[PDB]
Amino acid sequence: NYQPTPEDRFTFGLWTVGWEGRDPFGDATRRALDPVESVRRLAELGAHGVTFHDDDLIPFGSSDSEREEHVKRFRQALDDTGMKVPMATTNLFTHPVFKDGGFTANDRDVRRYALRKTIRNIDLAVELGAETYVAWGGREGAESGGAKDVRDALDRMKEAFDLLGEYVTSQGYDIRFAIEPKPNEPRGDILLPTVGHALAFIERLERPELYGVNPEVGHEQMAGLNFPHGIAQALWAGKLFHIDLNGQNGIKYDQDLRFGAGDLRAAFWLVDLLESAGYSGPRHFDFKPPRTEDFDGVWASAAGCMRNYLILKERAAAFRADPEVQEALRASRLDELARPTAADGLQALLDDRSAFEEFDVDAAAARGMAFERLDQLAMDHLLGARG
Amino acid sequence: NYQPTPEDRFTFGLWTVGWEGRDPFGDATRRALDPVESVRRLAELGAHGVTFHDDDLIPFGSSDSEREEHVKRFRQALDDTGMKVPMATTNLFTHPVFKDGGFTANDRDVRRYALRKTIRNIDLAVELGAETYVAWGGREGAESGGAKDVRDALDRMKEAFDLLGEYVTSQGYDIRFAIEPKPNEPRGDILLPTVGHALAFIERLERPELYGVNPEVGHEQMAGLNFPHGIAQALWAGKLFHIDLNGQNGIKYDQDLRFGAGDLRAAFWLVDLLESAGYSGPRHFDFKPPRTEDFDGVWASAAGCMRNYLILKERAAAFRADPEVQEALRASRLDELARPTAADGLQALLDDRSAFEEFDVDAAAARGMAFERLDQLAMDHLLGARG
Amino acid sequence: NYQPTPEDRFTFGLWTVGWEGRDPFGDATRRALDPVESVRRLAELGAHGVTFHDDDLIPFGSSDSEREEHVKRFRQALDDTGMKVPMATTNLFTHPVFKDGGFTANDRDVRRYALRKTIRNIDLAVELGAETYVAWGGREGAESGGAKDVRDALDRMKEAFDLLGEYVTSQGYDIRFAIEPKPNEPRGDILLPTVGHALAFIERLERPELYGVNPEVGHEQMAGLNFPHGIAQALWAGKLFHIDLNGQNGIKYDQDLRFGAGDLRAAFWLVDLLESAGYSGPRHFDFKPPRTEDFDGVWASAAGCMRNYLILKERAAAFRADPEVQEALRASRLDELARPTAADGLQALLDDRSAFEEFDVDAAAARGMAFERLDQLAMDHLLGAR
Amino acid sequence: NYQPTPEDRFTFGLWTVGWEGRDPFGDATRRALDPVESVRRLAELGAHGVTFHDDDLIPFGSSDSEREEHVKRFRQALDDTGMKVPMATTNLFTHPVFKDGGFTANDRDVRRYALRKTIRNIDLAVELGAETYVAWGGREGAESGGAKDVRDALDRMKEAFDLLGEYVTSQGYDIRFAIEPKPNEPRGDILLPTVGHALAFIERLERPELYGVNPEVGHEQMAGLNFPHGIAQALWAGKLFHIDLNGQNGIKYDQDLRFGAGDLRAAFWLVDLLESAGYSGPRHFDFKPPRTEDFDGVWASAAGCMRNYLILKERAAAFRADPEVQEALRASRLDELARPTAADGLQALLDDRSAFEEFDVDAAAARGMAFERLDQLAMDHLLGAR
Ligand SMILES: C[C@H](O)C[C@](C)(O)CO
Ligand SMILES: C[C@H](O)C[C@](C)(O)CO
Ligand SMILES: C[C@H](O)C[C@](C)(O)CO
Ligand SMILES: C[C@H](O)C[C@](C)(O)CO
Ligand SMILES: [Mg+2]
Ligand SMILES: [Mg+2]
Ligand SMILES: [Mg+2]
Ligand SMILES: [Mg+2]
Ligand SMILES: [Mn+2]
Ligand SMILES: [Mn+2]
Ligand SMILES: [Mn+2]
Ligand SMILES: [Mn+2]
Incomplete structure (x- = not known):
């Protein structure tokens, strides 16, 4: 059986099931999805909610009038289905202005624009009920050693996170931030490349209690590290604010397979640890249905994410109770x-x-x-x- | 030219040039070296000092009488040559009692013995003038997911580091600790596998100011990470207490090549950063002369470590001054x-x-x-x- | 119940359950096993047979009289238990004389000795009934670029395998060779690092039909490759003479975990492909019981290898029949x-x-x-x- | 001064300096280049020639009249500059029809179309003087185990290369094929993932002498392998028909850095081996100017590739002569x-x-x-x- 329901707290990024299949070497294989469609289909499959980048919900460059209608339609779908929006994030990586970073771009005018784009979306995130605001610094880093002085870039990253903590506390919002590490791709090497580097960086922010991590299964596996052990250290630190679930086959490009694919035994010990620790946040999937699939296969893959979590939950529970x-x-x-x-x-x-x-x-x-x-x-x- | 002298602060582990060449699949190819021989030969090559594990200087199980003579001879060689001992460490990995760890062994009697063996060597380290005491938890970790509860093992690791900080401050010693990360080998996965994980762990110790990191070039490269970027974050945190220099060709077993071998462009940006930041600690090599070599080749490889540092120092300086x-x-x-x-x-x-x-x-x-x-x-x- | 019997053709290297647990950072954690004990304990678990390097069965440097005693005792245990010896190999990697290789050592005298030591054990392998003689060139390669001219080394490697083919055909033996690829460790880079480069090299031998591959799960995974894909190309070439089963968790030192540990989905696709293609050779485990274990843990890990293959066999057959x-x-x-x-x-x-x-x-x-x-x-x- | 001239035989793919900088996480950062501009700018830098996929020179879906115009302009720029076209290839990976492969797509209709599109461009390649026609099967492989039966796929792949050999010999062309291996990306695992598995597959083709390899630095390094070792085995087999130069920093996505970046010592041992063995083919760069760069940065990165090869050539020759x-x-x-x-x-x-x-x-x-x-x-x- 293994039938998900909203109480299992499974969530998905709009960009996940909405991925059109454009890869390094190939054009899109699916048409874009309207977020309304994704919210309703995911609710039919038993999801609890969805998450978004600003630019997934509001096309970049939209007029205020277009922005209002996009948000109205999204909220309409959430209200019709009962879906929630627990987490949001900012796209600081698709537009060419971010080609050398958002918060750590060498151009100071770009760093200021990155923070303004982030703050505008924090306001929307809180309007939609999000409790966590993730930052994935996919463009922060370099391909060559002269291009980025890392201690200067860490000073600029801490500046930006401390300004965002000033804004959230000035506004009286309850939302907290979660940094999502990745060790490389699209930059040669990305700053804060692992759960440990982001945990250590947070201790140097002015108010560390406002920030945690959103570890992603495949990104720790891109460095060959043990994802359950990384999540154990984030729990021990009291910093597992959110988690991103997918699969990855070893050390290679970010595959974003559906959860349970890739390293199946690591997904077993991951669910064992989340359930033994009582992790109560979203079980969020950041996965790409492969570009071989049509829309039926998109929904099959999203269903499989949840199914495999539930199977492994059963088995880990049975192991610990035996x-x-x-x-x-x-x-x-x-x-x-x-x-x-x-x-x-x-x-x-x-x-x-x-x-x-x-x-x-x-x-x-x-x-x-x-x-x-x-x-x-x-x-x-x-x-x-x-059993 | 590139001729080292003691003012360049190059140091070497006794176990480095003393490695007998026993590997996973093969017997020793060289006889053991007396530490006296190593101190004198390294001083002839321009080194500043040496470092040691307890068991490199005093065979495991030695009587007090044997211990005294071993230390007398070592101090004699240091005094005759002018060599120093800036760093020491404990072997908590060779003896079979440590097969599931020292500080995080599941057996509590083993964890207590690991701390007693460490404290005895801290006293000797301070007698010999060391300023840094390194801990490499090579046996802390696991090959399977049930064998080690990581949050329990982190609690035991923090317990042990806080007891050692109680001992050093109770005795009025100035020595500080440096944790040396490694992501795997000899355990399947080792706890605190990278510079970022050890930096984050130190912030949860009772007196974080007593502890830093001793990053090793090859061990960050075992996870595919950028060693210069990791050293930049350790400098930004104020935690680069010591550093271990060698070479590694990518993601594989720990090679411990001589410094400059492996990733030569990363060794250039490493020396660029150490010299631009004004790093004033030992330039310590933790390398294994390959087992193909006889003793002449041991000394050639140690010489090459220093030579390559000096060449890259020249070139990085010329780049920044051009x-x-x-x-x-x-x-x-x-x-x-x-x-x-x-x-x-x-x-x-x-x-x-x-x-x-x-x-x-x-x-x-x-x-x-x-x-x-x-x-x-x-x-x-x-x-x-x-130029 | 997933209980193995000799009909499942599971075999183990003497060196696998007999590994004393010495690693580059640590001393042995277990005493050495008598090969007779290994043969009796593995037969009690359901195994079909064992395999050996020359120096596992006969201590390096043994006198002829000692050699005959070691072999006689071993053959008596085989006879008592019904165990077979399907495969044997030479140790051309432990002794320091092989520090720069056996068949590709830069010293010509060492290349000649490596071939003599191998031919001596081919004789013994055939006397014990082996059908396959494996070569693992774990010391063939380099740490640095000028140490080894690889075109020269491959000429030497082809010369060695051609001489060994000349020997087995000159003697009328039916035994065939299988090269076991590994990408690195203990050398920085090992020659013929994957099943692809071993298959390509065999086509340049004077009689390619005498040589196949013995691919090992963990070794292809040390290069990040798909082990079932490489075994499919080996089968497509008609060169899967033998196979070596274990587990590995990604790109790192060779772990040699028990089979089914490491990449469990790739273990399922491997068993699916082996049974779909009708592979009929030994299901040989080249694994190390971790050094954390005592002797009871050694036999539990060996039992586990066979259990996991039988569970995965059931599951892949149910998939294909549904x-x-x-x-x-x-x-x-x-x-x-x-x-x-x-x-x-x-x-x-x-x-x-x-x-x-x-x-x-x-x-x-x-x-x-x-x-x-x-x-x-x-x-x-x-x-x-x- | 390390100044390249056409005699150094450096060549570039139109797609390399023409890469618009779109990645999986980001939009293009540069406008598209006219192939005529690329040919003129590369000739000014000292290059010998260029290479192309069919869809780089002629936009996919062009009319015959448009096709003839695109080709005529390109040939006029070659003629004006003296640039050559030593190698060409087919794009069997961008268009969504190739999402499960070209020659190994599970759809038979798509396999047939992939061969038609390749044969059409072999004609054009020979008209422009190419000596080598590369195949990169970047969509041949799988993300999951049941999607692709690899023995079947290799039968299909051999059928395709045998048909293409039949075509070139039927026409009397002198052009030869070179397979370019890659281990993964964009597929989870790509078939024929290394120089070893490509060399082994060519021995099963009906006329192996028509096929060699086009190894790329970065692709072997994506499996952790030693690129100079793999090029030594390619030379030893007599199959180094062409080579693709770039840099990569270890086991990760394919970076395609300029040559000399990434693993600089392996770049020095590669140039030492190419010049010691007398390799006489193009020194072709398959690189991407990073998307951080503007058009001046594109030509600086292309110049850098050639400069680095000439510095390393000097240094390896001085090593061997000392x-x-x-x-x-x-x-x-x-x-x-x-x-x-x-x-x-x-x-x-x-x-x-x-x-x-x-x-x-x-x-x-x-x-x-x-x-x-x-x-x-x-x-x-x-x-x-x-
Ligand atoms: C939230 C984050 O931006 C999502 C990505 C793009 O998938 C990175 O993992
Ligand atoms: C100091 C440390 O114990 C030295 C080792 C054994 O080389 C680990 O890198
Ligand atoms: C047969 C081969 O020698 C066995 C090893 C030593 O385990 C390497 O795989
Ligand atoms: C010739 C080959 O198609 C070129 C690519 C696309 O760069 C892959 O290496
Ligand atoms: Mg994610
Ligand atoms: Mg070290
Ligand atoms: Mg093996
Ligand atoms: Mg290429
Ligand atoms: Mn990802
Ligand atoms: Mn090391
Ligand atoms: Mn192995
Ligand atoms: Mn490439």
Whole structure:
């Protein structure tokens, strides 16, 4: 079964199911979708809401009159279907003015325009009920070493995020920001390329509590990193404000496959961690239905995102509730991992002969970890051989 | 010429030139070196000092009597040659007791022993004059998802670093810690896999000012990331306490080539940034002379590390001092990148019609960045076609 | 129940369950195993046989008398258990003499010794019944550009494989060779780094029919490549002589995880292709039980390799037999892919206005491929969610 | 001064300096260039010639009258400047009809159209004097495992290349084909992903001598492979028909940086190998001036490609001519690598006690290779630091 409903909090970008299929080497294979169509179709499939870039909802350069009608129609569709808009973002990467960045463009006039375009869309985002405002600095970075002084560009990035935090708190809005890391593409190398670099950058903003991360499965996998481990560090920091779900087959161009495709075992341990941690934000998909597909295949792929989340939710829950797994976690000492190392304190540790002078290093080294039996019980659960 | 002298602050790990050549698939190809030999040979080549793991200087399991003689001989060599010991570290990865980690081992008795082994070596490090104490958590991580709860392991890592900061401040030592990230190898995935993840982890320690990073060229390149950009963010954070220099050819096993080998253009922009920022710490090489070499080739490779740093220092300096490069940096707007975006403040930006309502996005987009001519002047300087 | 039996032809290298857990950053975590114990324990788990490098079965530098004892004990355990030895290989990578290669070492004396050590073990391999003799040139390659002139090295490599073909045919043996590609590690770059470059090199040997490939999951994945695609080109060339199963998580050091770990979807498409094509060789695991494990963990990981192959075999067979999948395969034109483009010939195609002058490119471009529905049926089958 | 002249045989694709800067995340940043302007500007920089896909020179869907005008203007600019057209290719990847491939599309009608569109441009390529016709199967492959049965697809791919060989021989043309490998992008996995798998596939064509490879720096590097090693195996097979020069920084999207950017040491070892082996084909750049640039930046990046090749040519020739390097090459036994292992034959090697029974493995293992000194001489030559 695995039938989604709005309570599962699945959301999708308008640009996701609306991707026309223009790639590096090829023209569009589908016509543009009206956002009304996307909202209604996604609600029929069991989604909870949608998200948008400014330019997905209001064509760039629209008159105020055109802007009003575009927003009216979108809000009309949301109201007719019950869909929500939990997150919004700004396109600071499609227009050629952003070819060397928005907030870190070397041209100061471009950096000022990037912030004005962002602030205008924050007002709309709050009007539509969004709780999170994402920034993906896809054009911040370089192809060559002389072109961007990174410490200057970090100073300009912090300037822009601190001005946006001044604007949201000056207006009394509750919305918070989430930076979405990516390590490369479309620039040779992008600034804040991973969850760890964005977590560290936030600690240098004037009010760090206003900013978190929106990690994307494929973008951490573009650097060969373990996405569940990155999401564990973002949870430990208290900064998982939103998350973007898709698939990726290793280290290559950003594929944005539907969720569950790409690294299926990493998607299992991701859903295991989100549900064990009680993550209560949107389960947001940032995926591209491949350009081989027509519109029926667009909707099939969006459906598959949700389906695979629900299947993996079932299996991770069954693994953690299985008493033989809980016995194997004890044999692997996962319960000792969760106990403090030295709640007795420093002096007690220094005085504890069991910790050094009388520690039998050979007996401790002979103890197996029993990790392989634990992981085969995990595999059995993912494949439904256990329940 | 490019002849190093002690004032260039080049240092080497005892384990570097002392690597016997045992790899995943092969036996040692060289005999072990006595540390005395390594100190004297490196001083003949122009080094400033050496660094050590506890177990490189004192064989594991040594009696106190053996320990005293090993340290006496080492200090004797340092005193005879003028070499210094700026950094030390603990081996928490070779002995089988550390097969599931030191500070984050699931066995709590192992975590306590890891801290006792570390503290004993901090005392020796300070006796020998070290200013930085590095921790490379090579065994912290996992090969499978059930084996390590990452938020529990981060809690145990923070516990251990905060106990070590209690010990150093309780003893009145000036030494500071530097975490050396690596994304994988020998574990499937290692915790704090990049400079950004370690920078973010330090902000959650009780006294973040006691801890920085020791980034290694090849380990950021193992994740496909831009090492100069990572070092720029560590400088911007005020956390470049030490740095490890080597070469790596892309995304593969840790090669530890001599510095300048692997990605030569990244080593040029690395030395450009270290010298432009005024980095005043050790230029430390963590490299393995390939196992094809005999001892003559060990010393040739160590010499090459220093030589290549000095050549690239020359070329980066010449690039930045060349007036045609300085004119090209202006044509590329590197000087506008260094000016605040909106020192006038938020309200002035919102009221500035030149930033949105009257911004000519098409004229700004038509302006070329002139990056390719700048980067070809950089290439000409690296290859000595310009001066 | 997914219980393996010898009929499933699962085999293991002595070096896999016998890995003592020494890595470049750490000492052994397990004692060495007697090959007789490995043979008995693997037979109890359902395996079909074992494979070996010469130096796994006979310690390097053994006397002839010691050699005969080691072999006699091993053959007695094979006989007692019914286990077979389908494949053998030479260790041309542990001993420091091979630090710059065996067959491509720059020292000519070392190239000659590498061939002598291999021919000695081919004799033993045939005495133990092996059908395939693998070569893994893990020390063939370089860390630096001037160290190895690759055209010269490939001449040397072809000379070595041609001599070995001369030896096996001179002796009347039926054994055939299989080259196992790896892109890097332990050398910076290894020669013949993928199944493609090994297949291309075999076509330049004097008798290409004596040589195939032994592709390993993890090694193609270390170059980011699609392992099922490379095994499809090996099968298409008629060169899949043997296969080496394990798991790897992307582009990094060679992990040698148990089969089914690492890229689980690629493991499912590999088993689908092996059973659809009727591959009849050994299903050989080249894996390392992680060094975190004790001996009970070693046998659990070995059991896991076989269990995972049998689960994935069930799931791929259910996918291909499901009528709704067969309908989706037609909807995606997988049956048109299998029809010749132009059996009518060149002139007929040139004269066919339907292929150019009157071809409606827009109508054909509007046709969806329906690959996502197909793939979600495959995911539902893999996860038992139909 | 490193000033290129037409004698250096540097060529550029019309699509390289003419790239308008549209990427998957962004709109064009430059206007389209008239191919006549490109030919005149490249000749002013010292280039030898240009190359083209059919749809670069003639807009897709042009009338015969428009086609003849586009070609006539182009030929007049070639004539005025002295520029040549050594190579041409077909675009079987932009138009949405090719979304699942050209020669391996699951739709048979699309496979037939792909061959018609290619044969039409082979005619034009020969009229413009091309010697090599490249195929880049950038849409041949898949995102998912059930979408493409790779054995079937390779049968289709062989059928297409055999028909094209039939056409060129039927017409008496001297033009030869070169397959350009790429591992991924725009498809999840592309068939024939490296020089190895393209060389292996050509051996299964009906007349392998008509086909070689056109390896591209960046594409092998997208699989982490050593580009000079792959070009050495292409030369060893006698199949380096053409080469495509650019730069790439590791395993990521295809960057197509100017030549000399990306992996500069591998660029030096590539130029060393091309000039040592006497490669005599075009030195063709397949690069994109980054979209940050205006038209002056486009011509600076094109000039840079040629400048970098000429600097690296100087440096590699100085390395190989330096007596101290030649001495270091001997110290590392590069001259023994070039001597046959066993010209004496199999029986002589079996009877040679120096190769086994009396070989002193420890003495030989103690011999350093001296590769680091060698490599530091190469670095000092590359950087002009001797
Ligand atoms: C929100 C962000 O802009 C969405 C993109 C474009 O898909 C980047 O992942
Ligand atoms: C200091 C650290 O332990 C040194 C290693 C082992 O080379 C890791 O890079
Ligand atoms: C047969 C080959 O030697 C086995 C290894 C050592 O595992 C490499 O794959
Ligand atoms: C000839 C080939 O089509 C050129 C491309 C498009 O740049 C791919 O490398
Ligand atoms: Mg995203
Ligand atoms: Mg290091
Ligand atoms: Mg193997
Ligand atoms: Mg190309
Ligand atoms: Mn993405
Ligand atoms: Mn390293
Ligand atoms: Mn392997
Ligand atoms: Mn390319």
